[PDB]
Amino acid sequence: DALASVDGNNAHVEGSRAEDGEMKPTVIKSNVTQILRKVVRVSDTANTTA
Amino acid sequence: TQMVLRAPKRTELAKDGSYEKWMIEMEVGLRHRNPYASGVLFTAAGK
């Protein structure tokens, strides 16, 4: 969310009611997930070698 | 200091409908003592 933009021109005058302004809605963002992968393969003979 | 005249009060008013429109009123002013007690410096360029 982000507050409205300050203006400083607020000079409303007496009166039971008064004018209305604008309001900014809440924004929404999104991110996607990535898959990291590492494959490995080795023969049994090589795995047993010292 | 800060002079406040009307903080938002709550009283039984004729609030009808479903618009739910609300308003917030606040009357404020400012007071300063001994005008020559505070100083101001306006940053500007030469002639």
Side-chain angles (χ1 to χ4, degrees):
Chain A
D1 202 358
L3 294 168
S5 159
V6 293
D7 52 17
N9 308 120
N10 280 17
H12 303 133
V13 186
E14 51 169 2
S16 181
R17 327 298 170 199
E19 58 86 13
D20 193 324
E22 193 176 17
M23 76 193 72
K24 296 290 107 183
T26 182
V27 184
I28 197 165
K29 297 282 182 182
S30 58
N31 191 343
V32 175
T33 69
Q34 178 177 45
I35 317 175
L36 306 153
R37 181 178 286 177
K38 295 292 183 187
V39 184
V40 164
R41 60 95 177 172
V42 292
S43 199
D44 304 325
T45 67
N47 177 29
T48 306
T49 47
Chain B
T1 177
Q2 183 188 350
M3 326 306 290
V4 54
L5 193 68
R6 284 155 37 200
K9 311 318 190 164
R10 306 314 162 183
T11 318
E12 284 69 19
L13 272 191
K15 214 79 172 183
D16 43 358
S18 179
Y19 264 119
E20 303 311 337
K21 183 221 73 171
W22 280 58
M23 74 206 76
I24 320 184
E25 307 105 300
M26 163 168 292
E27 199 192 319
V28 175
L30 190 147
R31 189 258 297 286
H32 175 34
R33 302 170 57 174
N34 192 249
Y36 293 130
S38 291
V40 184
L41 174 43
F42 292 153
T43 50
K47 286 69 152 191

